[PDB]
Amino acid sequence: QYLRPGMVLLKKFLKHDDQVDIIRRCQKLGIGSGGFYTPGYRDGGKLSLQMMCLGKNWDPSYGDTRPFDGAQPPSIPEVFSKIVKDAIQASNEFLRQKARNDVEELPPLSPDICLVNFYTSSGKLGLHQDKDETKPSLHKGLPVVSFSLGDTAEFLYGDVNDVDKASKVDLESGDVLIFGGKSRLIFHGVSRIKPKTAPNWLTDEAKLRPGRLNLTFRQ
Ligand SMILES: O=C(O)CCC(=O)C(=O)O
Ligand SMILES: [Mn+2]
C-alpha cells in the first residue's frame, strides 16, 4: 500500500465486471479509428509495446489528433474517470488514516488523457519520468493513476535513471497505482511481464490475449 510519499498501490482495486468491461471497451476502441499502433519512440525505450490514447493524444507533445494518420482519439469513457476518482478518494482516506509528520493528501484529478499500453509477453518499457504535462499540472503534483490488467508487470520506480537505484513492485491484474505530490516525477518503467499470470476468469470472460493492458491517466 504506501510506497513513498504520494505513492499508493491499491491491490485488486478494480472489480470483476469493471476489469471485463475495461478490456472489452479497449478491444473495440483498439481496432477502430485511433486504435493501437507501435510507437516509433518511447522515452526509455520499449519492446513489444503498442499504444493508443483516449481523450487527448500524446505524440513524440500533446494534441487533438495523431499526426501520422489524423485520427482523433476516442474520448475517455465516463466509467473510467469515475474509477480514477474513486481510487484517489480511497488513497486519500488511507493517507488520512496513516497520518502520524504532515498529513498527506493527493490532489484531485480530472484526467483528460488516458494512455493505453498493451504489452505482449516479451514486453518492457524503460525508466522515464512523466514530464510532458503542462508546468502548472506538474508543479501542483497532480497525480498519475495507473490501471493494470492481465499478466503481472515487474514495475521499477525511483528517483533517477539507473536501475541500480530503483525499487520494484509487482503490478497484478486489478491493481491501481497512484503517484502524485512528491512522487509525481518518479522515474519508472516495466522491466518484465510475468507470463501466464492473468487470472483465468479474466482471460476467459474477456477473451484477453497473452500479455498486459495498462491504462495510465493524467492531467
Ligand atoms: O505500463 C505501465 O505500468 C507503465 C506505463 C507508463 O509508465 C507510461 O506509458 O507512461
Ligand atoms: Mn510513465
Short mmCIF file of C-alpha atoms in Angstrom, two decimals, residues 5-163:
data_model
loop_
_atom_site.label_atom_id
_atom_site.label_comp_id
_atom_site.label_asym_id
_atom_site.label_seq_id
_atom_site.Cartn_x
_atom_site.Cartn_y
_atom_site.Cartn_z
CA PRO A 5 5.21 9.99 -0.17
CA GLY A 6 2.23 10.43 -2.53
CA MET A 7 2.59 6.89 -3.96
CA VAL A 8 -0.12 4.41 -3.10
CA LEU A 9 -0.75 0.96 -4.53
CA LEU A 10 -4.32 -0.21 -4.33
CA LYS A 11 -4.38 -4.01 -4.57
CA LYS A 12 -7.10 -5.64 -6.56
CA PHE A 13 -8.97 -2.31 -6.63
CA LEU A 14 -10.68 -2.97 -9.97
CA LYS A 15 -13.97 -5.01 -9.55
CA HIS A 16 -14.59 -8.18 -11.66
CA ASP A 17 -17.08 -6.66 -14.04
CA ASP A 18 -15.02 -3.44 -14.31
CA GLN A 19 -11.94 -5.47 -15.41
CA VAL A 20 -14.01 -7.21 -18.05
CA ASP A 21 -15.69 -4.01 -19.17
CA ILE A 22 -12.27 -2.23 -19.45
CA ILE A 23 -10.86 -4.99 -21.63
CA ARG A 24 -13.94 -5.17 -23.85
CA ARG A 25 -14.04 -1.38 -24.39
CA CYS A 26 -10.29 -1.31 -25.13
CA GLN A 27 -10.54 -4.25 -27.54
CA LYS A 28 -13.16 -2.36 -29.55
CA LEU A 29 -11.54 1.10 -29.28
CA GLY A 30 -8.23 -0.63 -30.13
CA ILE A 31 -9.24 -1.86 -33.61
CA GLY A 32 -11.12 1.23 -34.81
CA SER A 33 -10.01 4.68 -35.89
CA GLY A 34 -7.38 5.99 -33.49
CA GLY A 35 -6.64 2.44 -32.33
CA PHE A 36 -3.41 0.69 -31.26
CA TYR A 37 -0.17 1.33 -33.03
CA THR A 38 3.51 0.56 -32.47
CA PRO A 39 5.23 3.80 -31.36
CA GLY A 40 8.45 4.56 -33.13
CA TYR A 41 9.87 6.15 -29.94
CA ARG A 42 9.27 5.93 -26.21
CA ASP A 43 11.37 7.69 -23.59
CA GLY A 44 13.35 4.90 -22.00
CA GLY A 45 12.97 2.53 -24.89
CA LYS A 46 10.48 -0.26 -25.27
CA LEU A 47 9.90 -3.80 -26.53
CA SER A 48 6.66 -5.48 -27.66
CA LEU A 49 4.55 -2.48 -26.88
CA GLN A 50 1.62 -0.93 -28.68
CA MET A 51 -0.33 2.13 -27.52
CA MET A 52 -3.31 4.32 -28.08
CA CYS A 53 -4.62 7.39 -26.42
CA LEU A 54 -8.09 8.32 -25.16
CA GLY A 55 -9.07 11.98 -24.67
CA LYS A 56 -6.06 13.99 -25.71
CA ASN A 57 -3.46 12.46 -27.90
CA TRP A 58 0.10 12.12 -26.66
CA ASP A 59 2.59 12.26 -29.57
CA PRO A 60 6.58 12.23 -29.94
CA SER A 61 3.84 16.53 -27.06
CA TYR A 62 0.04 16.72 -26.53
CA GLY A 63 -2.63 17.34 -29.22
CA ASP A 64 -6.09 16.64 -30.55
CA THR A 65 -5.18 14.15 -33.27
CA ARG A 66 -2.43 11.68 -34.10
CA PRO A 67 -0.18 13.32 -36.69
CA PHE A 68 0.68 10.16 -38.58
CA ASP A 69 -2.97 9.37 -39.52
CA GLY A 70 -5.04 12.33 -38.48
CA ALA A 71 -7.32 10.25 -36.24
CA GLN A 72 -8.90 11.82 -33.22
CA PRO A 73 -8.59 9.68 -30.10
CA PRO A 74 -11.77 8.17 -28.71
CA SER A 75 -12.93 10.12 -25.65
CA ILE A 76 -12.29 8.67 -22.17
CA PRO A 77 -15.32 6.60 -21.02
CA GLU A 78 -17.05 8.20 -18.07
CA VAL A 79 -16.84 4.94 -16.14
CA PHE A 80 -13.00 5.12 -16.40
CA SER A 81 -12.92 8.63 -14.93
CA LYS A 82 -15.26 7.55 -12.10
CA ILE A 83 -12.96 4.71 -11.13
CA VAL A 84 -9.97 7.05 -11.24
CA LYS A 85 -11.75 9.46 -8.81
CA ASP A 86 -12.72 6.55 -6.52
CA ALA A 87 -9.08 5.44 -6.45
CA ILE A 88 -7.94 8.89 -5.48
CA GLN A 89 -10.64 9.10 -2.78
CA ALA A 90 -9.67 5.70 -1.35
CA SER A 91 -5.98 6.66 -1.37
CA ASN A 92 -6.71 9.94 0.49
CA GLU A 93 -8.72 8.07 3.10
CA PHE A 94 -5.82 5.64 3.56
CA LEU A 95 -3.37 8.53 3.80
CA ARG A 96 -5.56 10.27 6.40
CA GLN A 97 -5.73 7.07 8.47
CA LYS A 98 -1.97 6.54 8.21
CA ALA A 99 -1.05 10.03 9.36
CA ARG A 100 1.14 10.15 12.45
CA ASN A 101 4.56 14.46 10.30
CA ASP A 102 2.27 16.38 8.00
CA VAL A 103 -0.95 14.73 6.86
CA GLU A 104 -0.52 13.59 3.24
CA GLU A 105 -3.12 14.12 0.60
CA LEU A 106 -3.08 13.65 -3.16
CA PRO A 107 -4.58 16.40 -5.38
CA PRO A 108 -7.79 15.51 -7.26
CA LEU A 109 -7.55 14.53 -10.88
CA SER A 110 -9.83 15.24 -13.79
CA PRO A 111 -7.90 13.23 -16.36
CA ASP A 112 -8.00 14.41 -19.94
CA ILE A 113 -5.69 11.73 -21.20
CA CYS A 114 -5.56 8.03 -20.89
CA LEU A 115 -2.59 6.31 -22.39
CA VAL A 116 -3.45 2.68 -23.12
CA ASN A 117 -0.36 0.49 -23.37
CA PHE A 118 -0.53 -3.13 -24.46
CA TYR A 119 2.48 -5.36 -23.79
CA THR A 120 2.85 -8.89 -25.19
CA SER A 121 4.77 -11.41 -23.05
CA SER A 122 8.24 -10.04 -24.04
CA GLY A 123 7.15 -6.51 -23.23
CA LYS A 124 9.19 -3.84 -21.42
CA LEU A 125 9.25 -0.03 -21.02
CA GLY A 126 12.44 1.65 -19.85
CA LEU A 127 12.78 4.10 -16.99
CA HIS A 128 11.37 7.56 -17.65
CA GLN A 129 9.54 10.44 -15.98
CA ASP A 130 6.02 11.56 -16.96
CA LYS A 131 7.23 15.07 -17.67
CA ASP A 132 5.29 16.12 -20.82
CA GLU A 133 2.31 17.59 -18.94
CA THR A 134 1.99 21.39 -18.51
CA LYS A 135 4.11 23.11 -15.89
CA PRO A 136 1.16 24.00 -13.62
CA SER A 137 -0.03 20.37 -13.69
CA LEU A 138 3.49 19.19 -12.69
CA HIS A 139 4.04 21.89 -10.09
CA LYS A 140 0.69 21.06 -8.44
CA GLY A 141 1.77 17.38 -8.29
CA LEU A 142 -1.48 16.29 -10.00
CA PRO A 143 -1.25 12.51 -9.86
CA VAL A 144 -0.76 9.77 -12.40
CA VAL A 145 -3.30 6.99 -11.92
CA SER A 146 -2.44 3.65 -13.49
CA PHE A 147 -4.68 0.63 -14.02
CA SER A 148 -3.14 -2.84 -14.51
CA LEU A 149 -4.95 -5.80 -16.18
CA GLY A 150 -3.83 -9.24 -17.41
CA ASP A 151 -0.36 -10.59 -16.73
CA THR A 152 1.65 -9.12 -13.86
CA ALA A 153 4.26 -6.47 -14.54
CA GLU A 154 7.52 -6.01 -12.60
CA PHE A 155 7.35 -2.19 -12.21
CA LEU A 156 10.52 -0.26 -11.40
CA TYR A 157 10.49 3.14 -9.64
CA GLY A 158 13.00 5.50 -8.17
CA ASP A 159 14.48 8.94 -8.22
CA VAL A 160 16.98 8.52 -11.02
CA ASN A 161 17.54 6.92 -14.47
CA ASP A 162 19.56 3.94 -13.12
CA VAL A 163 18.02 0.52 -12.33
#
